[PDB]
Structure 1
């Protein structure tokens, strides 16, 4: 199988490359590396020589491939994909970008949840497989055990989203903001006789100053939060909030009778883990023991954390989860509203299950068929 790699060099792509090396995916394919910036020089060597960098925009070159895996982004997909299909290419397009997710000829891939849908697609001529939004993938990796059994009536999701979803420059800006805050009060911070109100005043002033580094976010993130991600939609949702409902229901095959999913998506000062606080309305009063079992046994990465303070503080956080494939879920309990209302809190790495991991797993599934 001859597989083209586009966007292998960037943040998401680099995570994907490391995972492909770790799982020895390159043993199974003939990789062809593409560039949007410079061609003809040696391709990267991740264990074996792959020749040269090819032109990511050349239709005839792409037509020679059995599949493309792209992390290059929506601008790239919009430019290349329609022409490539119009020219007769029947290969597999495996894409991280949002561009094609809701296309009638694309399947959103999250195989621990929807392997059966993926396999049906592959066997019946579907050639486009798109990774879902970070928030969607991470929520379903935590709650797949409930959703697969049709037990969810609706879900409200309030999120705590990392800088990495906006990009590497945004992550850098977050850390720079942290430095500028600390710099402003370093002379008084450690002195207990210094007024905490004076420290606080200076932090607030520094954050509000024009020179505070805010080119990417537009406003401060460190020391604060931003309760709006992406463009407004006419019903008053942000695009980020809208994605949850439409993508989750496509993945689950419920488009004609969807589970309502809604809430507020909030950016917070974390590097690359998204967390979500969920009000889950169950159709029936399911005992918490069964809920816990159904969640825990759904897949190999979800981890149900006991509902206790110390273990929660250690396990159910970005500090614990960052850079790992683990998807902890905790604070699982029935709520004051009734025994059909379930509280849950979950954390997951945005670059792994939220970006790169579904792409490499989709490749392995296609290979095995």
Structure 2
């Protein structure tokens, strides 16, 4: 099987390449690397000599592939995908971009949750598989056990999303802002007797100055937060908040009687892990022990963290989860509103299960079929 890799050099592409090498996926395929700016240059060697970098916009060369995994971006897909399908290409298009996500011909891939849907799609001619919004994937990887049993009446999700989710330059900007903040008061901080209010005044002024690097976020992120991600929609939601409801329900195949999912998506100063504080209304008053069981047994990556202070601080955080495929869920308890109200706090790496991993897994499933 000849598999084309587009967008392998970017952020999500690099995590994918790294994962494909670790799982030795290249041993199972004939890799062909593409580029939109380094055509002709020798292709990267991840174990196999793939030759030179091909032209990512050459529909005719793309047509000779059996599948394509693209991490290039939405505009790329919009430009190339239509022309490629129209050229008669019937190969598998595995995309990280949100472009085709809601197309009737496409399946949002998150196999630990919807393997059956994916298989039925493969067995019935579906050739387009798209990774879901990073936030949706991480939410379902944590609560799949509940949704799977149709136990969720509705769910409010307040998120704490990492800078990396907006882009590599956004992550760089976050760390730069951190340095600028510290630079401004490094002397005072070194002086044990310095005034905290003096340090505070200086930090606020620094964050508010024109020199503070905010090209990418538009406003400060380090030392602050931004309660709005992506474009505004007519009902007042941001596109980020809207995606949760429509994507989760498509993944679960609940379009006919969707579960209401809503909340506020907030950008915080975390590097690359998204965390979510959920208010889950259950259709029944299930004993907490059984709830923890349903959650834990859903997949190999979710992890129920005991509702104890010390352990929660050490394991239910971005510092702990970053760079791993682990999806811890903690603070599980019934809420003051009633025993059919379940509180849950989860953390997940949005570059792995939230981006690269489903693409990886989808190729292995297709190969296995």
**Which residue in 1 is equivalent to 2:343?**
343
Report the CA distance between 1:118 and its aligned residue: 0.1
Q: Deviations over 1:152-178 (max 9, x none)?
A: 000000000000111010000000000
CA distance in 2, matches of 1:366, 1:120: 11
Please identify, of 34-43 and 70-79, the stretch whose mean Cα deviation from structure 2 is larger: 34-43
User: How much is the aligned-residue C-alpha RMSD, in angstroms?
Assistant: 0.6
**Which residue in 1 is equivalent to 2:324?**
324
Report the CA distance between 1:194 and its aligned residue: 1.3
Q: Per the alignment, in what secondary structure is the counterpart of residue 266 of structure 1?
A: strand
Note the residue ranges of structure 1 that are not aligned, 5 or more in a row: none
CA distance in 1, matches of 2:145, 2:226: 31
**Which residue in 1 is equivalent to 2:53?**
53
Q: Deviations over 1:116-145 (max 9, x none)?
A: 000000000010000000100000000000
Report the CA distance between 1:59 and its aligned residue: 0.7
CA distance in 2, matches of 1:218, 1:154: 33
Report the CA distance between 1:190 and its aligned residue: 3.1
Report the CA distance between 1:256 and its aligned residue: 1.0
Report the CA distance between 1:98 and its aligned residue: 0.3
Report the CA distance between 1:74 and its aligned residue: 0.1
Report the CA distance between 1:41 and its aligned residue: 2.4
CA distance in 2, matches of 1:26, 1:150: 38
Report the CA distance between 1:193 and its aligned residue: 1.9
**1:25 matched to 2:2:** no
Report the CA distance between 1:110 and its aligned residue: 0.1
CA distance in 2, matches of 1:216, 1:48: 37
Report the CA distance between 1:42 and its aligned residue: 1.5
Report the CA distance between 1:48 and its aligned residue: 1.4
Report the CA distance between 1:38 and its aligned residue: 1.9
| Structure 1 length-normalised TM | 0.99
Report the CA distance between 1:35 and its aligned residue: 0.5
CA distance in 2, matches of 1:325, 1:133: 16
CA distance in 1, matches of 2:165, 2:100: 18
Q: Deviations over 1:42-91 (max 9, x none)?
A: 11111111111110000110110000000000010000000101111000
Q: Deviations over 1:259-295 (max 9, x none)?
A: 0000000000011000000000000111101100000
Q: Per the alignment, in what secondary structure is the counterpart of residue 345 of structure 1?
A: strand
CA distance in 2, matches of 1:322, 1:368: 30
CA distance in 2, matches of 1:21, 1:111: 21
Note the residue ranges of structure 2 that are not aligned, 5 or more in a row: none
Please identify, of 247-256 and 37-46, the stretch whose mean Cα deviation from structure 2 is larger: 37-46
Report the CA distance between 1:40 and its aligned residue: 2.0
CA distance in 2, matches of 1:309, 1:225: 25
**Which residue in 2 is equivalent to 1:185?**
185
Q: Deviations over 1:336-360 (max 9, x none)?
A: 0001000000000010000000001
CA distance in 2, matches of 1:315, 1:38: 42
CA distance in 1, matches of 2:254, 2:248: 9
Moved over 6 A (4+): none
Q: Per the alignment, in what secondary structure is the counterpart of residue 257 of structure 1?
A: coil
CA distance in 2, matches of 1:44, 1:131: 24
CA distance in 2, matches of 1:100, 1:162: 24
Q: Per the alignment, in what secondary structure is the counterpart of residue 236 of structure 2?
A: coil
Report the CA distance between 1:105 and its aligned residue: 0.3
Please identify, of 226-235 and 35-44, the stretch whose mean Cα deviation from structure 2 is larger: 35-44
| Structure 2 length-normalised TM | 0.99
CA distance in 1, matches of 2:261, 2:189: 43
Q: Deviations over 1:304-345 (max 9, x none)?
A: 000000000000000000000100000000000001000000
CA distance in 1, matches of 2:92, 2:302: 29
Q: Per the alignment, in what secondary structure is the counterpart of residue 82 of structure 1?
A: helix
Q: Per the alignment, in what secondary structure is the counterpart of residue 214 of structure 1?
A: coil
Report the CA distance between 1:191 and its aligned residue: 2.3
